Amino acid sequence: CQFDLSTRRLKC
Amino acid sequence: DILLTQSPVILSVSPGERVSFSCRASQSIGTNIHWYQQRTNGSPRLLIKYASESISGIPSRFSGSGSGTDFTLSINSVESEDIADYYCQQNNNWPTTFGAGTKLELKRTVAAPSVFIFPPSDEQLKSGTASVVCLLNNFYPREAKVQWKVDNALQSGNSQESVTEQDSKDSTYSLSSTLTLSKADYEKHKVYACEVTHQGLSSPVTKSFNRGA
Amino acid sequence: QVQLKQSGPGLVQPSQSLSITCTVSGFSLTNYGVHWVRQSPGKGLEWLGVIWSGGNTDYNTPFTSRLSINKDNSKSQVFFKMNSLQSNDTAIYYCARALTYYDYEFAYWGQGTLVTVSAASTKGPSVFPLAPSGGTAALGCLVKDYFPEPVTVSWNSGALTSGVHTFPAVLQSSGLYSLSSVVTVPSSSLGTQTYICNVNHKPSNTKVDKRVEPKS
Ligand SMILES: *[C@@H]1O[C@H](CO)[C@@H](O)[C@H](O)[C@H]1NC(C)=O
């Protein structure tokens, strides 16, 4: 997926 | 460098169930693997070190096994606070390297969103921009549709959505849909509606307001 | 208790340098090494290097050229500096400490420093009220038009946390970020309690307290 800088969470 | 492959990419489980995360190494790394938890907006939290050794302050439902190339992180009874990403780390070989993580999602019962609409403030109107915000609060599952209408005209391309990650307590999501228009456009129209569609609603729910009322 | 606190989040011009201070307490830099790790969209978790108790440094292979770590034991500070940032150097940078002085099992982390590599200018946000109007009222703040991420929002100086949702920031076409933060409260408490969102955008030193009231 993506690693999202805003949330520090995997965003799939 | 050692390559660490974590599977699956997403795990979805119900509270109280057991759950396992796989970390696989490109060559044998003995038991030199560490595990981390990352919560929303968090720094990593060390859960298990050296494949199986416990860490102070980490709840006992966390445990790990494995040796060689195939490793397992286990939670014997999942709680809502476990909603997070999980990463493994090897340090048998320099440099220490991390896997790419597994996302832990929690299943729960359907909850219909509570819907709220917010007109633009008069403060913002002074800047010549108008933001109309629509809030869908505490729902499950994550899928939802927001449809904007201004004076019965379907709005398209002028809205953006943001969805929170799962709540650590009730496992719900919340969503904000922001409709952005120029002050000029905003003043030329009267009825602003956002229509919300969700599995837990038997009909779509509309919240609306008339400008200056 | 062991803590590591990093300097504030910020913007770095492309081809320019990144400096972060890690200030530690609860232990001495003469006894433990301090590691640096980043988390990028391109490469996830990536170990950068370490300054050991005795002042020696190791740097991960692709960083030997552009990375420098130093420290001041007395002041309990670790100094991280990386040259020549490109766009894909945008990441969260963390300092970290292991359980045992020589090891790499990271039990203690800094809070992370979000670093944006961009040519754009810093810009503080405007804060607008989301005014309230079955006994539960919703209210909030629209935090609009800032760069770069992040912004912090809390409610009533930390006192109000229950029922707070602070949405992930979204990037508008203008290249500026926007965000809302909401909270649900008893409608009977709107004539009694004050509701304030405390907004802090560190990269622009913009701090705003926005009182949010029912519209008249
Ligand atoms: C950034 O760009 C360089 C040059 O293409 C590449 O070698 C490096 O791996 C990239 N780093 C990332 C994605 O963090």
Q: How far apart are CA C172 and CA C62, in angstroms?
A: 34
Report the relative pairing of strands C170-171 and C177-186 from DSSP bridges: antiparallel
Burial of C112: CB neighbours in 10 Å, binned 0-12, 13-18, 19+:
buried
Give the mutation target among C47, C84, C88 for probing the ligand 1 site: most ligand atoms within 8 A of CB. Answer: C88
Residue of A nearest to C91 (CA): A5
- Contact criterion met (CB < 8 Å) for C138 and B135: yes
Give the resolution value in Å: 2.5
Residue of A nearest to C112 (CA): A8
- Contact criterion met (CB < 8 Å) for B41 and A8: yes
Contact between residue C82 and residue C66 where contact means Cβ atoms under 8 Å apart: yes
What CATH number has the domain spanning B109-213? 2.60.40.10
Domain boundaries, chain B: 1-108, 109-213
Give the three-class secondary structure for C180: strand
Chains in contact with C, counting 3 or more C-beta pairs less than 8 Å apart as contact? A, B
Instruction: Give the residues surrounding ligand 1 with Cβ less than 6 Å away.
Output: C 40, 42-43, 86, 88
Report the relative pairing of strands C106-109 and C91-98 from DSSP bridges: antiparallel
Contact between residue C53 and residue C30 where contact means Cβ atoms under 8 Å apart: yes
CATH superfamily, domain B1-108, is: Immunoglobulins (2.60.40.10)
Q: How many whole angstroms from C42 Cα to the centroid of ligand 1?
A: 8
Q: Looking up tokens 């169930």, which residue turns up?
A: B17
Q: How far apart are CA B92 and CA C126, in angstroms?
A: 50
* Shortest Cα–Cα distance, C167 to chain A (Å): 9
Looking at CATH, the fold of the domain delimited by C122-214 is given as Immunoglobulin-like (2.60.40)
Residue of B nearest to C162 (CA): B169
Q: How far apart are CA B198 and CA B136, in angstroms?
A: 10
- Contact criterion met (CB < 8 Å) for B38 and A9: yes
Q: Does C159 touch chain B (CB under 8 A)?
A: no
Domain boundaries, chain C: 2-118, 122-214
Q: Report which DSSP code applies to C147.
A: B
Other C-beta atoms lying within 10 Å of the C-beta of residue A9: 24
- Contact criterion met (CB < 8 Å) for A8 and C92: yes
Tell me the CA end-to-end span of chain B in Å, nearest whole number.
65
Q: How many whole angstroms from C88 Cα to the centroid of ligand 1?
A: 6
Q: How far apart are CA C74 and CA C29, in angstroms?
A: 8
Q: How many whole angstroms from C66 Cα to the centroid of ligand 1?
A: 14
- Residue ID of nearest Cα to ligand 1 atom 11: C88
CA nearest to B114, candidates C91, C137, C162 = C137
Q: Say yes or no: do domains B1-108 and B109-213 share a fold.
A: yes
DSSP H or E segment with residue B124: helix B122-125
Closest partner CB to C180 (pick from B121, B123, B176): B176
Give the three-class secondary structure for C157: helix
DSSP H or E segment with residue B153: strand B153-154
Which of B 22-51 lie inside 8 A of A, CB atoms?
Answer: 38, 40-43
Q: How far apart are CA C125 and CA C163, in angstroms?
A: 24
